[PDB]
Write a protein that binds this DNA or RNA. Structure first.
Lengths: 207, 49, 116, 134
RNA sequence: UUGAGAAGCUCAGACGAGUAGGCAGGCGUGGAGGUUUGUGACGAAGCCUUGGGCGUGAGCCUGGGUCGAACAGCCUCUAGU
RNA sequence: CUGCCGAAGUUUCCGGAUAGCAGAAACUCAGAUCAGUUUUAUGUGUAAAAUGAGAGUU
RNA sequence: UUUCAAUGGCCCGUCUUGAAACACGGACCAAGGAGUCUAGCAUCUAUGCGAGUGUUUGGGUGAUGAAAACCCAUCCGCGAAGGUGGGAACGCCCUUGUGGCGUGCACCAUCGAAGAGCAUAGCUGUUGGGACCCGAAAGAUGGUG
């Protein structure tokens, strides 16, 4: 599984994805470590995606990998990606950062879509708070300084922008913006705190 | 009135004798820390290996 | 009067080649004879252990090898060294005993006159 | 006077290339100071021990919080002290003994490039130096 | 606006004697590892010539005549330079 | 071969150690000190205004 | 390019001398021709490692030069044996700026009593070594007529 994802020819990297189709639909609990090992494989699957048309079709394929995971470990799958993109964000190079920006753009939009789906089953405030707890121990955690701000500025830039796309008609009241309000409050990176609102597009009309 | 001139000759010998044993101890003490002060395995680097 | 070390790689290879002809002449036996363990005779290194010249006569008799045959199965003799500490007798007797454990001895044909 | 390093560590001519831009395009004195010290000779950049760094952050009132110590030069360890505290450090070089000791018990080590992407303006960083006398 | 050999490109102002001496950048010779998938009997090297050029300069490139078997530019190494 | 900086040419003690001039580095300051400067005024010196220049160290 | 016309310009190097005067050296052309090689010391810089550091005495090894490269055993050398203020940098502000509140490196004042080397290469300096090159009667040993 893992080795073939980072293969040196697309005809074999592609075949790893639909072989991952059944694997991610397994009805058993996956530890965080297994997802981190998987996501490295997937992170390097996107790393060498050459053509711009292809490398933006794969992002949509990878974003679509979220709802097919079991409902229990869908949060863990999202959490590992934000961890496995934060640590290797410094490794990327200018020509390869135009696709992980979009890839992060796709996934951050897929997180909202799952909330819309889970809103039909459970209470909106319950699931959103659980997702908000995912941002608390991940990218928006004040305890670890290892997280780059380039993702955090990106997330703020496209936070509300993909909130409108997920909810064309209207967004209900919820703590959508809580992760930022919990970062511009007590984050110890004073430059990130200082310049986060200037790039956010927060509106309180519905919140 | 002090020892002898050839009895201060041994003063180097009681100074130099504890050289070899000190140096050997420094070799094993450095190695002992080397076993202690090593980086963990990084369990994510066996994905491809 | 100046010396140059240009033959340093020449001399090392000459020594290796000199070892290989010795191994050719004496196949089964090792190129080197066994040496005992002794302690340097100074307050600076007295806690060390190194090699000696050969095994003293108390080291041979205690181990169970006569002094005459010892010269023939490769065990060397030092008439000058003596055993003052039993730990020096012990470290070198067991050094002989482990050697005689791994020592294959080739029989030699012997004259057998018809009478006696 | 000094406006080009005497070094030929090719990666130090890339580090300077990053802090020449930062120094002239930001208003912080941390960058103008960092760039100057990337020009200094090996003699003028003393090793700064781990214990000396451990004392500086945990000095007087302590209250280390999570400030990052930054030094241009090596950070050699100090086996004479057993318990190293949690530390975030940025330096040109570490020693394999020191870098393991920081990593094993506490925070993390950084190079000058990882500090810059976190605190380009020198945001909440302690800039230390080793004892020059030697 | 393309002007990232960032060791680049660009803008402004003042200045310019020189021994002893201090600092810096270069030119040239023989040979050495790399390189130009380099040049050469359709003429190498050399040589002469009021041929043409290049550089403040050390020096360099080229035309013609002789000539006949080797030679060079570039990055470093090196010295009986 | 070109480019930059460029003295001293002598005090002072005593063949010298100093110094000085020139540099080369490291420092701390222009909200600080200065000047082969000139005034003001107190008793030619000294002390405190202008004119200029960033000045001082190791 | 040769030549002419007008304006000009005391032979070069050394040494001497403030300066010249000088006295020297120079018939002409080609080639040869003089801070080099090395051990020691100190300095500056560059590199590797850093409370360490240094494979090349030697051993292991090296099938395509094998005097290279590559690897490490036992030594060994050289190292290793607290307050006050001024201060670099940063944060908090807040009449903002101004500044204050701080935290205070290197270091300096003060009161006082949390090692930075080792090895290689270069540069300049210095001491030896034939010592930048050339030039003073030698003297001594041993021979010749």
């Amino acid at each position: 599984f893992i080795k073939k994802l980072a293969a040196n020819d697309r005809k074999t990297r592609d075949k790893a994805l639909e072989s991952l189709q059944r694997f991610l639909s397994q009805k058993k609990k996956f530890e965080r470590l297994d997802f981190l090992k998987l996501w490295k494989g997937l992170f390097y699957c996107m790393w060498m995606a050459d053509k711009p048309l292809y490398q933006q079709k794969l992002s949509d394929n990878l974003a679509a990998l979220v709802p097919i995971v079991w409902i229990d470990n869908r949060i863990l799958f999202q959490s590992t990606f934000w961890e496995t993109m934060g640590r290797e964000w410094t490794g990327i190079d200018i020509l390869r950062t135009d696709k992980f920006y979009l890839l992060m753009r796709r996934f951050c939009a897929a997180a909202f879509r799952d909330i819309q789906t889970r809103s039909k089953t459970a209470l909106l405030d319950k699931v959103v708070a659980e997702y908000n707890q995912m941002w608390m121990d991940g990218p928006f955690n004040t305890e670890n300084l290892a997280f780059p701000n380039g993702i955090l500025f990106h997330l703020a830039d496209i936070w509300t922008e993909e909130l409108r796309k997920v909810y064309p008609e209207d967004v209900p009241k919820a703590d959508w913006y809580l992760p930022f309000d919990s970062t511009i409050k007590s984050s110890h990176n004073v430059v990130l705190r200082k310049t986060l609102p200037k790039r956010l597009d927060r509106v309180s009309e519905y919140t | 009135t002090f020892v002898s001139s050839t009895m201060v000759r041994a003063a180097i010998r009681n100074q130099a004798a504890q050289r070899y044993v000190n140096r050997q101890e420094s070799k094993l003490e450095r190695q002992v820390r080397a076993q202690q002060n090593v980086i963990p395995e990084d369990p994510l680097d066996n994905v491809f290996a | 009067y100046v010396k140059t070390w240009f033959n340093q790689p020449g001399r090392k290879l000459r020594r290796r080649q000199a070892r290989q002809t010795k191994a050719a002449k004496i196949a089964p036996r090792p190129v080197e004879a066994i040496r005992p363990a002794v302690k340097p005779p100074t307050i600076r290194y007295n806690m060390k252990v190194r090699a000696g010249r050969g095994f003293t006569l108390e080291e041979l008799k205690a181990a169970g090898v006569s002094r005459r045959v010892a010269s023939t199965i490769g065990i060397p003799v030092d008439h000058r060294r003596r055993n003052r500490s039993e730990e020096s007798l012990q470290r070198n007797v067991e050094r002989i005993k482990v050697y005689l454990a791994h020592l294959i001895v080739f029989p030699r044909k012997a004259g057998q006159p018809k009478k006696g | 006077q000094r406006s080009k390093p005497a070094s030929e560590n090719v990666y130090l001519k890339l580090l300077v290339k990053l802090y020449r831009f930062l120094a002239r395009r930001t208003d912080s004195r941390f960058n103008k100071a960092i760039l100057k010290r990337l020009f200094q000779s090996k003699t003028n950049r003393p090793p700064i021990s781990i214990s000396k760094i451990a004392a500086l952050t945990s000095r007087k009132s302590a209250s280390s919080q999570n400030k990052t110590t930054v030094v241009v030069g090596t950070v050699t360890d100090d086996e004479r002290m057993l318990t190293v505290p949690k530390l975030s450090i940025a330096a040109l070089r570490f020693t394999k003994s020191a870098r393991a000791r920081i990593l094993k018990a506490g925070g993390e080590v950084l190079t000058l490039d990882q500090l810059a992407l976190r605190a380009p303006t020198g945001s909440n960083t302690v800039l230390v130096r080793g004892k020059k006398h030697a």
